[PDB]
Structure 1
Amino acid sequence: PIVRVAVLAAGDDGGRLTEMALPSELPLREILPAVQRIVQ
Structure 2
Amino acid sequence: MPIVRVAVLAAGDDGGRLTEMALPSELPLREILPAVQRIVQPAAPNPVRLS
| Unmatched segments (≥5 aa) in structure 2 | 42-51
Name segments (4+ residues, structure 1) moved above 6 Å: none
Match of 1:29 in 2: 30
TM-score norm. by structure 2 comes to: 0.69
- Structure with the largest fraction of strand: 1
**Long gaps (5+) in structure 1:** none
Q: Higher RCO, 1 or 2 (CA under 8 Å, sep at least 6)?
A: 1
TM-score between the two structures when normalised by the length of structure 1: 0.84
More helix by share: 1
Of the two, which has the highest radius of gyration?
2
RMSD: 1.1
